[PDB]
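Notes continue from the previous slide.

Worked example: a multi-chain complex. Inputs as given:
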Amino acid sequence: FGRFTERAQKVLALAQEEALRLGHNNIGTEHILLGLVREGEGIAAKALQALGLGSEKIQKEVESLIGRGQEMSQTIHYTPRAKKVIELSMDEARKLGHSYVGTEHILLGLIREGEGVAARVLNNLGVSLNKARQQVLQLLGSNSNANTPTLDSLARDLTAIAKEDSLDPVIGRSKEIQRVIEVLSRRTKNNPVLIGEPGVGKTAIAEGLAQQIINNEVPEILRDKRVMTLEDRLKKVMDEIRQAGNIILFIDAKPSLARGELQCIGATTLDEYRKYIEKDAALERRFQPIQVDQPSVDESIQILQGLRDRYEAHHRVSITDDAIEAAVKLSDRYISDRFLPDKAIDLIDEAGSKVRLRSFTPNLKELEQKLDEVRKEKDAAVQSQEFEKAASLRDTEQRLREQVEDTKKSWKEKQGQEEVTVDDIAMVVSSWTAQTETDKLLNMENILHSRVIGQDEAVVAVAKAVRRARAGLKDPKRPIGSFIFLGPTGVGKTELARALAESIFGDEESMIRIDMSEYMEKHSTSLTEKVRRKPYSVVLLDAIEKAHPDVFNILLQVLEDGRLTTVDFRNTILIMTSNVGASEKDKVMGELKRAFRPEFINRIDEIIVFHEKKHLTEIVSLMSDQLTKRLKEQDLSIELTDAAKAKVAEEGVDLEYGARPLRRAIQKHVEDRLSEELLRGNIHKGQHIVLDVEDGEFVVKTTA
Amino acid sequence: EAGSKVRLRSFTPNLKELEQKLDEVRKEKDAAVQSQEFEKAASLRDTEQRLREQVEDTKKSWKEKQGQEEVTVDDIAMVVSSWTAQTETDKLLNMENILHSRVIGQDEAVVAVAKAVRRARAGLKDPKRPIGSFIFLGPTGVGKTELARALAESIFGDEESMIRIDMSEYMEKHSTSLTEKVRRKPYSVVLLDAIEKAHPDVFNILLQVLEDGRLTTVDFRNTILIMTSNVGASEKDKVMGELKRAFRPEFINRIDEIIVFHEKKHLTEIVSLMSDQLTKRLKEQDLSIELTDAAKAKVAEEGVDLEYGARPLRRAIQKHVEDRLSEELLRGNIHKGQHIVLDVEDGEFVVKTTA
Amino acid sequence: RVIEVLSRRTKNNPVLIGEPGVGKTAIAEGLAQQIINNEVPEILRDKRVMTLEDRLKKVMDEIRQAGNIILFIDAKPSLARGELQCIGATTLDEYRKYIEKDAALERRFQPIQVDQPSVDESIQILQGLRDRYEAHHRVSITDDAIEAAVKLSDRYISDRFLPDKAIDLID
């Protein structure tokens, strides 16, 4: 039912050897017992030799209670009892740290489930059940002043605990450690408080002192000193200390107070510590702080490999190195709202399962269903008996049994296909957040062009700017891009912002949009919510000419630092629109310098200017397509001929109003008309409906 | 802070490596011993202790790092600077040289401030009053603020130790300050922009600051107060006139000093400064870039228009350099960690490689 | 999405937010079934789902002392301490009012968006427990009737989750 020693495995199959040597048909607990004393060398075997139970004495009792011997041997199986007995030895070893079952555990497992034939062999051979579990025990085993009290667990001894050679690496935070020691010597602000964003690292700093005092370089009196860890036992143990003082306490979460000794290292948060020194002033006194910088990126990497081995526990890692490289780097800059050693680890785990998960996900379900009723059909008849009329049905259930197996044991065909390398690691991430990823970049223009018509002047400026920042050149703390979009309305200002979101951030809808009409007065308090919500989004502020010059002091701070105080923009693409040019490239850039404070205009990455028939009709088509899709959902199939989109487009030529009119004119010439046409009974819906122009007039046609 | 720290610089040669070595040994010895390989250890053991005594001999050679490791001042002044004399008075004697490297034109102003600070900072002015009380007159974007920064940087150590209020905010009988930011950093250039706007109430307060360098109960004796204004602007004599008429005299008279704020090759000198800040921050990301003088020229072309000045250069650098290098690295034309030069060819930008 | 948030080490413990509404509690019975037979990491096999004053730290001590446990709530926090591992069901906002507590919140526990079921999905839920509302004497059936219970609710009033509404009409 798993994997044991040879000795186990041999003793088990050895039960079968005995299954047959007597001719019986099911191997019960009595055979497992013969199995043990008959491999004569297992600890299990050894024990029995103690109680006075050779193979001779036993098999005589057993044959004296079963004997021959239907040679049937029709491919036998277990007793349900003995199957329990096996399930048990597995547990009689969890209960011993024995990572693998063996001859003893099976003997242990038999006693535990004493109801059965083995048990009686012995209660018959005058060998009560406990005298027996004893003998096995006495053949296996194991592996201090005030520590008495302390040494509950509460709260395990970092020191002697890592004196036993038993300690690993450990990677720091190497200068994080030593600052725990300037403080842990003083006589002033004596007891050090470990403040840093939670984790991991933190617990690792104290596992440091531990490592340091012991092997061995340290100073201002600190040798033979333990570091210990983790209400009706309270100050109890704490007195074993006011009477012997080789001990630092490591805390997690309170002060029963410096009534004297008490050396402790502080587990607390940026702010949580200000939940001590305010009520004061044991803080500015005893307790005293120090911060956990996020461990070195490269140090970050060789931290996992240490616990790589130990998560190998779920099946894939160890490896790949190329797999970890991911986890760590992704986090440091790509969200990017934790601490540089904790994050990475978490990611693995998503995948530190997500792969054994995806592993145990063919169409081989329905046989189970078939199989089910057969057994069922079998049962009903046997209690009706009707044997043959069923035994049919058993010979028949069983054909299907060994059937499914050879596609479930054919699923160690699936162990093989999952192996460690980045393959498994990064797919993990496709959730938590390269050829056709830089191709989006090199080919951005091609890409933005298929959505934004006309406006090549603008697209190429943005393409290149994004590509600049996105390639390493611009400072990362500042947004990806800061632009101002000048030009008339309904030209593509917003439309480009969408296409940017879609191409750059993945979703035509990952776009925050404020209307600065709302912020014209000294009430200019932003936005920061929506940016905390999605910190990866085109941030579009429409018509900034309206904002109170206050606002600019804020945006200015964003442009400079890409941060507010305390939101983050380093991942946004800020786009601010305006009518400042409008009426009107030189006369324009002029009205701009006169409308906006220069300090501001100068911190903007780029000023984009938005200036054909063929573009109108390209738009009409975009719009028309959004429509024909949302109708297909309502079982309506429509199509506009290129001739028809032309005729709609005619309705946005007048330079004065631009391309606004098109949405309305589409609903009028298409929506309104199709309704009136469906209602009047001319188009039997769910046929195919085309809108065309005939003699310069709109016409509706059908072609199912 | 120092009462362990030095006992520590004790506990920090690259003989970290020896022990590293000795390890591999035990194993061979040990693991060998499990295989035996006996005399294959005898000498192996011996090879071991050869090492060990060598180690311990140089591990106790650092009793010398003991006989070496003090106290004097320099230890402290560290501690201090990490909480916020020749090249400290040299900052003073040579202040002008120093302010000049940050503030361009404006020598009229710099020398006035240099000398004033140097007066107060030398024992002559009364210590309870700010280090310096100035008014900066002149047009916008000339260097008013810029000098205040450079002062902070040179005098107080940090181009950013500077409080800055906007007196637009204090035009009404609600004139209740500021004192927080000054309690926060009591050593900082305090810059009040456009004082022409303040309610004459405010002046009664500032006045108290100028006189006593104290409010009631904050302290300014360590600030450098600088107040700007457009009072001259439109317009040295016609100006000092519009000033006497705009500000109560009691006030103007307690101010240490009234300060007045009055090429292609400079643009490209700027482009280069900027470009250098960049090429450094990329070297960190294993990116080696260089602009030819020909290229910085072509960027500079983009800040000639007298109207907008030299603002455009930062953006145009990211566009013609950053954006382009990305697009160029991504398209796979520049195998990063080779040497990358940006040059102009036929009046157009070109990228070249020379590992 | 629960089992990721549960197979981790970082955000150990999951928390479902949506109108309350979508009988969030329904998703939880989900694990029981899959942890058993059996599609789930060997990282979680052999565990147990469960739900819910003087009986204080008593039984909770009698559990940290037994790691094989996952828990369900809708309302305390000795968080992260033991293997004390939760699954939380709490309103759109109420959670706002707990990570607002922070920051063992934003840490240990961690959320996923519960959907107001696809309208058709609604219908199927009804039938599965149709045979079980035969208790009040009139069902099973009629299908044609169920579709209404559901359908009218999504568009017509219009003040709940699309699976609670239905069953309420039915009852």
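Summary box: Chains B and C do not touch (no CB pair under 8 Å). Strands of chain B lie at 132-137, 162-166, 189-193, 224-229, 257-260, 288-291, 339-344, 349-353.
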